Ligand binder design. Structure first.
Ligand code: HEM
Ligand SMILES: [Ca+2]
Ligand SMILES: [Ca+2]
Ligand code: NA
Length: 366
């Protein structure tokens, strides 16, 4: 039967109401209403938790979106491909005992949905509940890495859950709110687009610009040249320059994926809806949805998309594009004014001094 939660929310199932206080605690204790570092980490964790599953190897290889990262924090978070995932894992573990009726698998996915809701332009994703509260650790080798080629990436996603090339590119819209701490050992929080606190299509445009240098070292595995490498970290600042992943570059230019990649440029609603659909599929890997219950109503309404059009960042323009898609013309867009690169802020408030919640815990890094 239907019910009304303590916050006034109408749900199709009263068990959904347990998630209301969980969302409140996730915000008050970790996410702080922001599309910031901790939100980004948790969204990355939804993927590392979910994708560790394989049709061809069978169920013993991993249970998908099963909370295995939280329940066995000494195993998967320390595999090489998950270096750095410990921060999100250690931030979520305490919620398992604070909200003991909610499984680790549900916790990971619900935290991701709440985190996304803090990001202007992000979709309000589906949330199904009821993932069982026990599993085993996945094997190593199931998480794509940034040095991987497109054939490998596409095969891994197909084997994980039958994702199509379009769905893979759609999921990578998440790199619109993403930075790197481990790719370059000399850099912290190197952003993948110029708006890492905004769920927009800048990532799609900016990967298509010609690379001109590196924000740090020039020879890191999985990294390629960036179109906007300038930061202020050489003078002690925290506004790290923009980083480009080899995998994002490869997706942007491969015949299977390049038109899907370009098709999101300046198509905010199409991008966000496409991400939402593929992400809902990711979130239930390892489960038959018939065995889950719809608790989508308890995902917070996301911050609205920003008013700002999609534009070329200062000092760039259409002459800098490297295009690969014949099927669709790249749209005419304005160029942000300015003679030098604009520093990409380290914080959603535009400053450099913001700090993030980090709980101690059992997962480790490097
Ligand atoms: C081919 C598939 C993918 C590859 C190779 C990849 C690679 C990476 C790498 C190397 C980083 C930086 C980690 C670090 O050094 O700190 C990163 C960050 C991130 N990834 Fe991906 N990723 C992929 C797919 C996805 C998907 C499917 C999602 C979610 C739907 C996702 C969400 C994120 C987020 C939110 C971050 C930022 C984390 C932070 O700023 O703390 N990624 N990814
Ligand atoms: Ca898992
Ligand atoms: Ca962005
Ligand atoms: Na990070």
């Amino acid at each position: 039967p239907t019910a009304v939660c303590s916050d006034g929310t109408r749900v199709s199932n009263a068990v959904c109401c347990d998630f209301v206080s969980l969302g409140q605690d996730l915000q008050s204790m970790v996410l702080q209403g922001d599309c910031g570092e901790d939100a980004h980490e948790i969204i990355r964790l939804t993927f590392h938790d979910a994708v560790a599953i394989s049709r061809k190897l069978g169920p013993s290889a991993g249970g998908g979106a099963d909370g295995s990262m939280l329940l066995f924090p000494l195993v998967e978070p320390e595999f090489a491909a998950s270096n750095g995932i410990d921060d999100s894992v250690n931030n979520l573990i305490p919620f398992l005992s604070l909200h003991p009726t909610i499984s680790a698998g549900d916790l990971v996915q619900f935290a991701g949905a709440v985190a996304l809701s803090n990001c202007p332009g992000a979709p309000r994703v589906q949330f199904l509940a009821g993932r069982p509260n026990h599993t085993i650790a996945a094997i190593d080798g199931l998480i794509p890495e940034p040095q991987d080629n497109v054939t490998s990436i596409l095969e891994r996603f197909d084997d994980a859950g039958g994702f199509t090339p379009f769905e893979v590119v759609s999921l990578l819209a998440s790199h619109t709110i993403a930075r790197a701490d481990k790719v370059d050992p000399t850099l912290d929080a190197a952003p993948f687009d110029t708006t890492p606190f905004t769920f927009d299509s800048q990532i799609f445009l900016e990967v298509l610009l010609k690379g001109v240098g590196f924000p740090g070292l020039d020879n890191n595995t999985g990294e390629v040249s960036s179109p906007l490498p300038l930061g202020d970290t050489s003078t002690g600042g925290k506004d790290t320059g923009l980083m480009r992943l080899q995998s994002d570059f490869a997706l942007a230019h491969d015949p299977r994926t390049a038109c899907f990649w370009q098709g999101f440029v300046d198509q905010q609603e199409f991008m966000s809806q496409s991400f939402a659909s593929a992400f809902a599929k990711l979130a239930v890997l390892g489960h038959n949805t018939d065995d889950l219950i719809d608790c989508s109503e308890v995902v917070p309404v996301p911050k609205p998309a920003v008013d700002k059009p999609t534009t070329f960042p200062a000092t760039t323009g259409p002459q800098d594009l490297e295009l690969s898609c014949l099927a669709e013309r790249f749209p005419t867009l304005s160029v942000d004014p300015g003679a030098q690169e604009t520093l990409i802020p380290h914080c959603s408030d535009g400053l450099e001094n913001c700090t993030s919640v980090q709980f101690s815990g059992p997962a480790t890094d490097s």
